[PDB]
Structure 1
């Protein structure tokens, strides 16, 4: 069971790495714990929508859940389900719930497709050891092109009922002296226009996104992974989860990999060895594999930085109740297109996505996913008893994030005479959701747990390629940064190590 290169996971870091490895002539095997999402379900579609969730919506849960912010309207469609290898996984830690994708393409399957480059001045602040010129002159443009990032037509956006929710918030923010910015996306906007005209099957305009899009969204399986398979040097094995990693007696790596069926039944456990090992299991997955390896003694030379520096990208969700004369619309595209930019690198910085709501009826609610600058970091500690990495993060650690998000929206509320909603996240009268995360960043920080290109400290031919490399914050939606950084890392690695 030997393969020259093995890539764990099939998310952004993994996809970029596998493509370049394949192009360099290196036979590569990608191991993905989730499924290859290409089989039509009971409704004839691959993915379930947000108004008709079923077992495909969740990674081994016994009941469906409403998208955060829409419980009041979507709980009615929740149903009990059989634990299944679904597409969206809500990982519950002590005081933090991290949402991640499971399947070929990782988070690209369930994300909002928002492709945004971080502010250069901020990138230079968070990663001082990295050459920012190479990043902005070469790697970011490369990522933009490969990801198939596109831009919404302004005339269509301005006239369509599907983005009224966005225009309402723009107007409200404008009164507080705040401006908005268009957010590039991997969802084909031309296709979206055709959806509204009833010319093609709807996806974004049919309340679909978080459990996958049956059309329009150019997830990784269609971009990087498709190209990787096209090299003829890359293979992908699904429902294969790597459990342990060790260094063979000669410098290479051996992995224990469990193969399961969609019901989670263990079919077999196999040994896979390789020369080059790339981890792309995400901020949670890669960090867990390494903290486990260190603490169980299979990779004893890993440093103390492994597991540290985790941050939720300052993720905070909040909502405002609009005046009766400012309805947000019953028809809201599932793909965000506008955001409020109030990020200047200071502590009050906030970059907020104007989030659509799937209710399907007028609620007058404006939803926002704020990205803030909070210095608090958590640490993944290995629990040998349960063989699980535990995230040491407490809810109060998000206080700075809530404070920044509140200060911004308070300005908008003041300028418009509106108030927050306090009932969207539960019965505790909370206006700010502070214990969830869509953008997990850190755990195997670049330059700390690894060198400046992701080479894991203490080992040769061992690499980390994903969100675990980011120092807990990027100030914008993270996948373009993860992709660009991965392009930079693998190119150097192939040149010097391979």
Structure 2
């Protein structure tokens, strides 16, 4: 029942923690509620594609859903499914739906692979207590190297039909006096070229991404976690969900864990104790464990900052209708490679990525995922009745995000004489999706609910290492920042505490 160190979750913060602990010679156990994705399914593949979703695509749902923005074309392939330990979980709150990955590797399994560093000037604004020099000189470079971040061949990008959709938006943006930037990725671009040449089995060019990539994507299980297991000091137990955390009489920690099968049946409830406890259950997961512990009295010394400071990273999705003479192409790579940088740290800041359309036919639609600067924050509150943490966030709190995104795209529309599509996000005629979130951040903010290195306030040997540490916004896709911050924190923790 005892293990020196226990890491909850296997996402970015958790993976960095497990590797460094293993290298320091600390016996570590990682607990993951999802599955280890290494078993071929009914089709011979591990993951299902976006055009053939099945039970593997969803975390205990009774029917598959079309990826946001492609309902008009992909709802036709949706089918009823048996509740299963799928890879993608759509967590629905009152006025917000948060998407998160479930399994060994966490969000790295289902994300777009976009590895971007935030602007130093913005980083300094959101975390004034952290030394930006150490981060940019040592930690960010370490993260990029370990994550196996790479750059796309610009010549291939210009000629390939698979990125026609990106070139069209670049041209449209240019007229509005806007510039584009190449976004690094963890998907092997060299492998992507070989897919286009039909030399290797396709994944990114076979409409795969959101439910996992059977090839090419360097998810955490291939990078950090592979290295962690390679130390001989790390072990990962799957289909194990941590329910409660408490402090033993002597200062150690004890956890109640439920082991279930892929169908959701409770196999057993275990008790695991440890000396060092690292939380890497994500912005939603870590926060819920902590608010529950504080409010049910198992960790009564947690401060009032626990549960506060949540933000969706200003996530807003919109789409523009192209002129008949500007086709986006039927063949679009599932991995984004270009972005529009309009981030100046002001209230109108927008960092938008040019997103592909999985339709498989010409739609003339240009899809965008914008990241804006919206000061509004939500708060996680514990509901003792249902034993669940609820997110206090209203749709109107995303108005500043919508306003900023609208201002940028109105410019592009004006310069090109185009209009928005208002029929892509379900019912209503909405041009902007304002109630979804791919980047949940906050809930246990660094320096507020914890010290400047993630040591949870009020306790010793209790650490948070994930997206819950970030103050609701980073200005770009978050995983590189989560990884770099984890590197900074765990290094200090190993030196001082372990």
Coarse TM-score class (shorter-chain normalised): over 0.9
Residue aligned with 2:56, SS: helix
Tell me the CA shift for residue 400 of structure 1: 0.2
CA distance in 2 between partners of 1:78 and 1:255 (Å): 38
CA distance in 1 between partners of 2:232 and 2:71 (Å): 45
CA distance in 2 between partners of 1:424 and 1:228 (Å): 42
Residue aligned with 1:256, SS: strand
Tell me the CA shift for residue 291 of structure 1: 0.1
**Residues 136-180 of structure 1: CA distance to partner in whole angstroms, max 9, x if unpaired?**
000000000000000000000000000000000000000000000
1:427-446 alignment runs, 5 A limit: 427-446=427-446
Give the TM-score normalised by the residue count of structure 2: 1.00
Residue aligned with 1:382, SS: strand
Tell me what 1:121 maps to.
121
1:124-139 alignment runs, 5 A limit: 124-139=124-139
Residue aligned with 1:7, SS: strand
**Residues 51-79 of structure 1: CA distance to partner in whole angstroms, max 9, x if unpaired?**
00000000000000000000000000000
CA distance in 1 between partners of 2:341 and 2:12 (Å): 25
Tell me the CA shift for residue 311 of structure 1: 0.1
Tell me the CA shift for residue 427 of structure 1: 1.7
CA distance in 1 between partners of 2:389 and 2:173 (Å): 41
Residue aligned with 1:98, SS: strand
CA distance in 1 between partners of 2:51 and 2:373 (Å): 33
CA distance in 2 between partners of 1:344 and 1:220 (Å): 32
CA distance in 1 between partners of 2:353 and 2:278 (Å): 32
**Residues 95-149 of structure 1: CA distance to partner in whole angstroms, max 9, x if unpaired?**
0000000000000000000000000000000000000000000000000000000
CA distance in 2 between partners of 1:152 and 1:356 (Å): 16
Residue aligned with 1:488, SS: helix
CA distance in 1 between partners of 2:366 and 2:213 (Å): 23
Residue aligned with 2:116, SS: coil
CA distance in 2 between partners of 1:437 and 1:16 (Å): 24
Tell me the CA shift for residue 352 of structure 1: 0.1
CA distance in 2 between partners of 1:68 and 1:256 (Å): 36
Tell me the CA shift for residue 240 of structure 1: 0.2
Asked whether 1:41 is paired with 2:41, we answer yes
Tell me what 1:227 maps to.
227
Tell me the CA shift for residue 443 of structure 1: 0.2
Residue aligned with 1:396, SS: helix
Tell me the CA shift for residue 217 of structure 1: 0.1
Tell me the CA shift for residue 353 of structure 1: 0.5
CA distance in 2 between partners of 1:453 and 1:435 (Å): 31
Residue aligned with 1:246, SS: strand
**Residues 286-314 of structure 1: CA distance to partner in whole angstroms, max 9, x if unpaired?**
00000000000000000000000000000
Asked whether 1:243 is paired with 2:243, we answer yes
Tell me the CA shift for residue 251 of structure 1: 0.4
CA distance in 2 between partners of 1:353 and 1:87 (Å): 24
Tell me the CA shift for residue 192 of structure 1: 0.1
Residue aligned with 2:104, SS: coil
Runs in 1 of length 4+ with deviation above 3 angstroms?
A: none
How large is the RMSD of aligned CA atoms in angstroms? 0.2
CA distance in 2 between partners of 1:83 and 1:349 (Å): 41
CA distance in 1 between partners of 2:2 and 2:491 (Å): 23
CA distance in 2 between partners of 1:204 and 1:294 (Å): 43
Tell me the CA shift for residue 484 of structure 1: 0.1
Asked whether 1:97 is paired with 2:103, we answer no
> Can you give the 5+ residue segments of structure 1 that lack an aligned partner in the other structure?
none
Residue aligned with 1:178, SS: coil
Residue aligned with 2:412, SS: helix
CA distance in 1 between partners of 2:359 and 2:60 (Å): 25
Tell me what 1:294 maps to.
294
CA distance in 2 between partners of 1:365 and 1:252 (Å): 55
Tell me the CA shift for residue 374 of structure 1: 0.1
CA distance in 2 between partners of 1:233 and 1:70 (Å): 44
Tell me what 2:162 maps to.
162
Residue aligned with 2:185, SS: coil
**Residues 322-373 of structure 1: CA distance to partner in whole angstroms, max 9, x if unpaired?**
0000000000000000000000100000000100010000000000000000
Tell me what 1:403 maps to.
403
Residue aligned with 1:150, SS: coil
Tell me the CA shift for residue 392 of structure 1: 0.3
CA distance in 2 between partners of 1:150 and 1:315 (Å): 24
Residue aligned with 1:49, SS: coil
CA distance in 1 between partners of 2:307 and 2:198 (Å): 49
Tell me the CA shift for residue 221 of structure 1: 0.2
CA distance in 2 between partners of 1:440 and 1:353 (Å): 17
Residue aligned with 1:455, SS: coil
Tell me the CA shift for residue 426 of structure 1: 1.3
**Residues 33-58 of structure 1: CA distance to partner in whole angstroms, max 9, x if unpaired?**
00000000000000000000000000
Residue aligned with 1:369, SS: strand
CA distance in 2 between partners of 1:147 and 1:286 (Å): 23
Asked whether 1:321 is paired with 2:321, we answer yes
Tell me the CA shift for residue 496 of structure 1: 0.2
CA distance in 1 between partners of 2:358 and 2:418 (Å): 22
Residue aligned with 1:346, SS: coil
**Residues 243-265 of structure 1: CA distance to partner in whole angstroms, max 9, x if unpaired?**
00000000010000000000000
Residue-pair matches, total: 498
Residue aligned with 2:220, SS: coil
CA distance in 2 between partners of 1:405 and 1:227 (Å): 40
Residue aligned with 1:165, SS: helix
CA distance in 1 between partners of 2:326 and 2:252 (Å): 62
CA distance in 2 between partners of 1:354 and 1:400 (Å): 21
Tell me what 2:76 maps to.
76
Give the TM-score normalised by the residue count of structure 1: 1.00
Residue aligned with 2:275, SS: strand
